[PDB]
């Protein structure tokens, strides 16, 4: 409603690096707010893409950013009779970035791992890995729960049970307010998907440089499934946390599986022990229900509500039966132990192939009225197909069905304006939360300040 | 003097297209006086079989390894009944596996690239996305011999990249060999799930499908490892633009899935890929074998001084003034057009000529106009 469309702030990165693929806010001990940007195709020291992370301070005029250095060298280590090898070429570092307190977690899902034992091996597979950084103290650590040293013949004999070789850990990441990092692995358990949880302090305290295989004493992983509905469901495409029980001591996880039950899609609400509490099923096949999930209280009653996005939803029109426009579903949390029934609200896109609902960002109380608001991105919306971001306000019975404000892409075509959004954080100390939008096709980030 | 229209050639229309005459009369000598008009009739009738193009898409993964005989037996029988239905048939084929990129593809040991088939005992071909093998041709023996030489490859997961094959067969016209005036049929053979849009992010691919043709001189889809899988709406739009009719030849374990996909892609059909002859597929194809076309008239080399008016007579005797075309005609049906020619003044040139011709047919009526 009050985001300023005229005075924008622009941040740019190296050409071809996909700067703006993922982004987040970061805060120092002194309280200043900066932006963390991931560029998963940045060139390494040998003119090979490895990815990168940039730490952009807040200037009104924008500009270039300094890069947060990591280690980009492949490692080989001899342990008894085995050799452990890590391969970081085209690992996609910066595909997902998150921040908690003074810790940046930047995760590379396409890092490859191998174990060689004489004439056998465990096969070169994308286990994924990801890096924890403390820039102020210059501390560095790594976390990779899906590495192993079991050869492929054992996996063949087991009928591929408990197979975490293609995890791609770091596809999606979240951090609870207690300080525990949760990672989604959509390819875990032979592309069924899994979740890996571990305390950040334990990760920093259990890391020794040189040992490529180690185990964190406090990590918990989800369980393999025998149900055919979960096959190829990509459990871990998107993750989120929230309070969905009434007990403030326990935390609840929301996980999206956009291909669950033969490309139908689902969103599951579990507790901290990976036991199901609820499951919302998709409405149409192949619409990627579960691509984006968000948790925020828009009704203004204290109970968190759920937003789900299906960017490939095809609505029934008059002149086009298959109008692939996208959809957003709003479920309101009821009183007591009642379950989440039918969706409270449906929002549908207007532009064809716009992929409406591919990113939902809770904006907080943008206009300071008493109810939370959201922002939905259509990366190929608008009459020209450049991109669009629509702001939806909250009211006593949910969200407003009409957008209060529409922001158009300031970049050329094909820039993917809205692939990543971040709100709910005030960056210029004026009292109203601001918004940052990442267009990786142009390798840029746009900052909108609310009034 | 009285204007007249003497019929010169009045060969009756043929009954079977096995020379064939489709326009009667064939030549008329019109004679006119200044500022006068004269009317005459023409009869058009379709007695020639309709063209058909059929393109096959074959799954050549490890799961579809012992089902190769089933999909090569369908192609020896599907190319036989169409030779009894229509005399103008083109048949071609291509193959698909999946994107040749990890994690869909084995990449270790360095001997697993030359054959993904290595940790087992046997050997099988390297990985590829989609390759065009046989362009649409009227030779059947060549088609069968070419199909018999196809072997399988091996990849990791169960869903396959068979929709990139569908788009690349649809939008590459000069490479597949689609004809402008024909009925286009695309048979898609599989036995497992399929990869859909936004599924390629697990390989590092985020660029959406653009719906253009990326098959080069090596007959290989080049952007397989660069752009994402196509979605349902883009596939539907392109199938509608190119006038392609899509048939799903799938095994019994996956029939219901592709039956649920057909409601989301209107104009598509689903059969079963059995062992004997896939009789459901053949019956469906012969059911589509009812293809009834239109008849439209055009004027060629009309002198400026002359003006023409048309009255159409389609099925039954429903005469439509001011019409020179009929729709909804079945192969064998006949329609009649009454054409009136009026001359303005008296041209200096004594003799002229023009032609009335059905659109898309060699047969035509030549009118030689003489001014008296």
């Amino acid at each position, epitope marked *: 409603l009050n985001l300023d469309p005229v005075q924008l702030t622009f941040y740019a990165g190296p050409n071809g690096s996909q700067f703006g693929f993922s982004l987040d806010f970061h805060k120092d001990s002194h309280g200043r707010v900066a932006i963390v940007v991931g560029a998963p195709r940045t060139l390494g020291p040998s003119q090979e893409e490895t990815g990168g992370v940039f730490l952009c301070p807040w200037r009104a005029e924008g500009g270039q950013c300094p890069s947060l250095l990591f280690d980009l060298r492949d490692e080989t280590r001899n342990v008894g009779s085995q050799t452990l090898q890590t391969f970081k070429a085209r690992q996609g570092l910066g595909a997902s970035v998150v921040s908690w307190s003074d810790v940046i977690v930047a995760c590379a899902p396409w890092q490859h791992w191998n174990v060689l034992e004489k004439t056998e091996e465990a096969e070169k597979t994308p286990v994924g890995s990801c890096f924890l950084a403390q820039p102020e103290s210059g501390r560095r650590a790594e976390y990779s729960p899906c590495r192993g040293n079991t050869l492929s013949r054992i996996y063949v004999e087991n009928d591929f049970s408990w197979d975490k070789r293609y995890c791609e850990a770091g596809f999606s990441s979240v951090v609870t307010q207690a300080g525990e990092l949760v990672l989604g692995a959509p390819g875990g358990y032979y592309f069924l998907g899994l979740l890996a949880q571990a305390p950040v302090a334990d990760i920093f305290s259990s890391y020794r440089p040189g040992i490529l295989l180690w185990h964190v004493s406090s990590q918990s992983l989800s369980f393999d499934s025998s149900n*055919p509905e979960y*096959f190829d469901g990509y459990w871990g495409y998107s993750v989120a946390v929230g309070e969905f029980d009434g007990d403030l001591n326990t935390t609840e996880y929301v996980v999206g599986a956009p291909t669950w039950s033969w490309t139908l899609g689902a969103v599951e609400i579990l507790d901290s022990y990976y036991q199901r509490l609820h499951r919302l099923r998709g409405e149409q096949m192949a619409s990627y229900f579960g691509h984006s999930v968000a948790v925020t209280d828009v009704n203004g009653d204290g109970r968190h509500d759920l937003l789900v996005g299906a960017p490939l939803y095809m609505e029934s029109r008059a002149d086009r039966k298959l109008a692939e426009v996208g959809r957003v579903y709003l479920f309101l949390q009821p009183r007591g132990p009642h379950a989440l029934g039918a969706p409270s609200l449906l929002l549908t896109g207007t532009q064809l192939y716009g992929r409406f609902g591919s990113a939902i960002a809770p904006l907080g109380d943008l206009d300071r009225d008493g109810y939370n608001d959201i922002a939905v991105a259509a990366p190929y919306g608008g009459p020209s197909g450049r991109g669009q971001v629509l702001v939806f306000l909250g009211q006593s019975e949910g969200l407003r069905s009409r957008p209060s404000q529409v922001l158009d892409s300031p970049f050329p075509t094909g820039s993917a304006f809205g692939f990543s959004l971040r709100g709910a954080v005030d960056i210029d100390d004026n009292g109203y939360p601001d918004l940052i939008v990442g267009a990786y096709g142009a390798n840029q980030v746009a900052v909108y300040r609310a009034q | 003097p009285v204007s007249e229209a003497r019929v010169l050639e009045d060969r009756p229309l043929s009954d079977k297209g096995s020379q064939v005459t489709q326009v009667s009369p064939q030549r008329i000598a019109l004679r006119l006086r200044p500022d006068d008009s004269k009317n005459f009739s023409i009869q058009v009738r379709q007695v020639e079989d309709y063209p058909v193009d059929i393109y096959y898409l074959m799954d050549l993964s490890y799961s579809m390894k*012992d089902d190769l005989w089933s999909i090569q037996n369908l192609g020896t029988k599907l190319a036989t009944q169409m030779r009894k239905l229509t005399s103008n048939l083109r048949i071609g084929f291509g193959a698909f596996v999946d994107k040749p990129v990890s994690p869909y593809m084995y990449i270790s040991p360095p001997e697993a690239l030359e054959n993904p088939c290595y940790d087992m005992k046997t050997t099988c071909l390297p990985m590829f996305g989609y390759k065009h093998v046989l362009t649409l041709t009227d030779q059947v023996t060549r088609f069968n011999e070419e199909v018999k030489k196809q072997s399988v490859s091996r*990849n990791r997961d*169960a869903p396959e990249g068979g929709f990139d094959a569908i788009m690349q067969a649809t939008v590459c016209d000069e490479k597949i060999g689609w004809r402008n005036d024909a009925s286009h049929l695309l048979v898609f053979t599989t*036995d497992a799930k399929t990869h859909i849009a936004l599924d390629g992010r697990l390989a590092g691919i985020v660029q959406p499908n653009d719906g253009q043709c990326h098959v080069g001189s090596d007959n290989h889809y080049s952007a397989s490892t660069t752009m994402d899988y196509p979605s349902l709406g883009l596939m539907t739009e392109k199938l509608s633009q190119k006038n392609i009719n899509l048939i799903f030849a799938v095994t019994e*374990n996956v029939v219901n899935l592709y039956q649920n996909y057909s409601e989301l892609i209107p104009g598509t059909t689903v059969g079963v890929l059995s*062992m004997d002859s896939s009789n459901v597929l053949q019956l469906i194809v012969d059911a589509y074998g009812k293809i009834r076309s239109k008849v439209e008239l055009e004027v060629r080399d009309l002198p400026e001084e002359l003006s023409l008016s048309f009255n159409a007579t389609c099925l039954n005797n429903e005469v439509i003034p001011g019409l020179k075309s009929c729709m909804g005609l079945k192969i064998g049906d006949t329609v009649s057009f009454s054409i009136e020619a009026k001359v303005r003044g008296c041209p200096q040139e004594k003799e002229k000529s023009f032609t009335i011709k059905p659109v898309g047919f060699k047969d035509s009526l030549i009118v030689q106009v003489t001014f008296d």
Partner: antibody
Amino acid sequence: RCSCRKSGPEVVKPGASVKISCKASGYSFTAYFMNWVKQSHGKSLEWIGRVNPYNGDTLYNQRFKGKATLTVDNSSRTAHMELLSLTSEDSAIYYCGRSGAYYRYDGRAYGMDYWGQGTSVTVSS
Amino acid sequence: DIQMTQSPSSLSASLGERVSLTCRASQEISAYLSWLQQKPDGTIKRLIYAASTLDSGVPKRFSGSRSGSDYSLTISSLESEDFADYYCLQFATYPWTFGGGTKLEIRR
């Protein structure tokens, strides 16, 4: 590894009904078909039918369509078969076999592996 | 349905001999065939599937190689353990059908 444990011998009357089980362990049990086979006194194995544990869809041999009902119990990972209107011709040994239904990799089911132990049913008054 | 015909109904051999059993199909089955051995006990085990592929743990002495019409199972250097009954299963079209049965006998 994979175990298929069946119930004990049954002696029934000529006209009654019997219900035999095959408890499965060591695998998923929901991604595999459950086939039942009848071997008479003079060898000659016959296929009775199969049941889908995920959804209780049964495919029957035409000869045994109205004679055996194939059910499942996912809670205890146990398959069942019930024979109705027993006569002197159904006294034989019945086997439970496991076959592949849903695959997570580029592969296909190649028959019935991992058979059971054999349950002998004798029908006599 | 498809009827499978097993040529040797009974086979008698000595230790160390080489024997072969043939199973032919009435209709066309491409490579959908498996070989089963039933020991005196009632226990049934699958030895070869896909008409040529050994199972895990079967010695590299049992072999099978053919497709199309005929199918064969061969034992070279016949040992004392493998004197049992053998069957072929088609599983190409429903209903699944079995072979007649071949029982191996020791010649002494």
